[PDB]
RNA sequence: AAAAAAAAAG
RNA sequence: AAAAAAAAAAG
RNA sequence: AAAAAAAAAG
RNA sequence: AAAAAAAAAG
């Protein structure tokens, strides 16, 4: 088994059985952001790849990095 | 003939039932029409019909499922 | 919490807490449909009809078929 | 042409990938024309171009993967 | 080769 | 209570 | 970074 | 309301 600090980008929907990244069961942004150590953390942490839906994207728990001027 | 319903699906773009009869939502914006839509491809958000496990306290401000009176989000 | 009764989806079961049993080999279980292993990973039969019936040529289908049906 | 390729889908009828290009088997049964069909709908079972995992021992008769010679199933 | 690249209000 | 996060640590 | 390279009989 | 009851060879 391997464990990666890497955020997995399908979260709760995510059906890899063997996935080694990390997955968030709250919409709530861990207060450590991609600082977070905790293997099993349940809260968000950053994805790293630009959101397909830009600065107009209207998820508010979108995880996935987005232009400035996108206003929360 | 067609089988499909205007009842809203549970599971949303993640539903992966080939054959499933039900609305899909495909944005985080709620339908201007409401429950009362009538378009069977529309693509906005509809309420479920079926009690959120969450209650009274659910706090996720897209959640379509039926909550008891007094509910509030930020 | 888990149960004896057969997944009927197997490895392609995407219910994070199914409580029920998967299979992960084609080969069925030596002690049949009243094993009593909670881990077992050999099939076990699914209780539900067929929807391929008599004629259904998959071999290792789990799901019930009636007597006609007759596997090389 | 279209995007659309004659390359076999490794997952199948378990295929989530809603802009998914290959092509998905829906039976068991191997196209008689193996490797060599050309139907972009063809819906039987095609060689997949991956290695299996399981090698020279997989015992799964619907197996589309790569096998090495000297693999045997049941007669 | 698994995000809603389906746009109608994104 | 057979596919939602009734998994809680801040929900 | 989506196959059962998880094995007990694969 | 998650099996290929979608068929061309099932
Ligand atoms: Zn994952
Ligand atoms: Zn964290
Ligand atoms: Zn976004
Ligand atoms: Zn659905
Ligand atoms: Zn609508
Ligand atoms: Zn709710
Ligand atoms: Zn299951
Ligand atoms: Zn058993
Ligand atoms: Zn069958
Ligand atoms: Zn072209
Ligand atoms: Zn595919
Ligand atoms: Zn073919
Ligand atoms: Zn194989
Ligand atoms: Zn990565």
Known sequence: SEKSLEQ?????????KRCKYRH????????????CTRID???GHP?????????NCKNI????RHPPGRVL
């Not at 919409?27 to 991609?34: K, L, T, Y």
């Open 61 to 64: 728990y979108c995880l996935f």
């Open 8 to 16: 997995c980008k399908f979260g709760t929907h995510c059906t890899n």
């Open 24 to 35: 968030a069961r709250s919409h709530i942004m861990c207060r450590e952001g991609a600082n």
């Open 41 to 43: 953390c349940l809260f």
């Open 47 to 55: 994805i790293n790849e630009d959101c397909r839906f830009g600065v």
